[PDB]
Amino acid sequence: METETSFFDLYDVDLKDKRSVIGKGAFSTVHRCVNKRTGEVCAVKVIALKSLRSSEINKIKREIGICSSLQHEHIVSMRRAFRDESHFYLVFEYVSGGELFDEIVTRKFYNEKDASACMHQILSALQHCHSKNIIHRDLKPENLLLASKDPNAPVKITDFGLAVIMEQGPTYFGFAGTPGYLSPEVIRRVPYDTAVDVWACGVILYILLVGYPPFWEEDHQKLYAQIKNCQYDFPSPEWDSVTTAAKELIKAMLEPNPKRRPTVQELLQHPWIARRDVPGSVHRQATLEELKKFNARRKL
């Protein structure tokens, strides 16, 4: 990262203007900035250093190393990273399509084939991550973005703040991730690996098909219990119109034991992902309505 040059020397943005703010998070704020030299529109992630403990700062530096190691079409590319005496500035490629789940609910047509295109992009990005021994650890709809408000815009995964680098096989990296997408191995606090990402994909794919998560419980202890014992189902009637290929793919992605869980490469070679005509074609309006309820529920 550039510790000598100021972000404000290479990029232009008024951090005080409201119309510059792309996103407001609890630990950072993402503004729309413009490359002074090239005119490229970018999303800078501003992180004040003020109240930050050392663990948080090194978490950020970890995110910078990992994000710089990653150059893939379906990963939001970090252009450059800056650190001055008060702020981190993580410049990223501009992403204007918003969250994937916020856009699916606005589609007039959505079927398993669309869900398979999304999952294909997510899986390919994950294949690039795991190839470099990177575990995202926190895959969730908030991290699944669309590059543009255009149809057929690419899905890009993002937010590697919780990402870890696995050097020596299954390793304990701590208990992190959002509860609904936590892998059983992480809940058990045993050493884990890239398989945890696969787990989240399963949970995500499930949602992509029906609009509600397989593990939903307000009590996080009963939720972690459901995840450990792999207590989920395909309720009628929503799942009766789903291909058994998708159902089997989710059953595989949600394998309670990481050793029996497919790698992302194996998933990318699954017929529901690789064959353009295995996923169902019928429009799933119920998935869209349930997904509006879901999007509403997670924010609140």
Residue numbers in the entry: 3 to 302
What's the publication's text?
Ca2+/calmodulin-dependent protein kinase II (CaMKII) is a Ser/Thr kinase that is particularly important in neuronal signaling and cardiac function. CaMKII has a unique architecture, in which the catalytic domains are linked flexibly to a hub domain, also called the association domain, which forms a dodecameric or tetradecameric assembly. We reported recently that the activation of CaMKII-α by ATP and Ca2+/CaM triggers the exchange of activated subunits between different holoenzyme assemblies. Our data are consistent with the idea that the CaM-binding element induces the hub to transition from a closed-ring form to a ring-opened lock-washer configuration, which can release or capture dimer units.
Although S. rosetta CaMKII contains a residue that is equivalent to Thr 286, it lacks the two inhibitory phosphorylation sites within the CaM-binding element of the autoinhibitory segment (Thr 305 and Thr 306), as well as sites of regulatory glycosylation, nitrosylation and oxidation. We expressed, purified, and crystallized the kinase and hub domains of S. rosetta CaMKII separately.
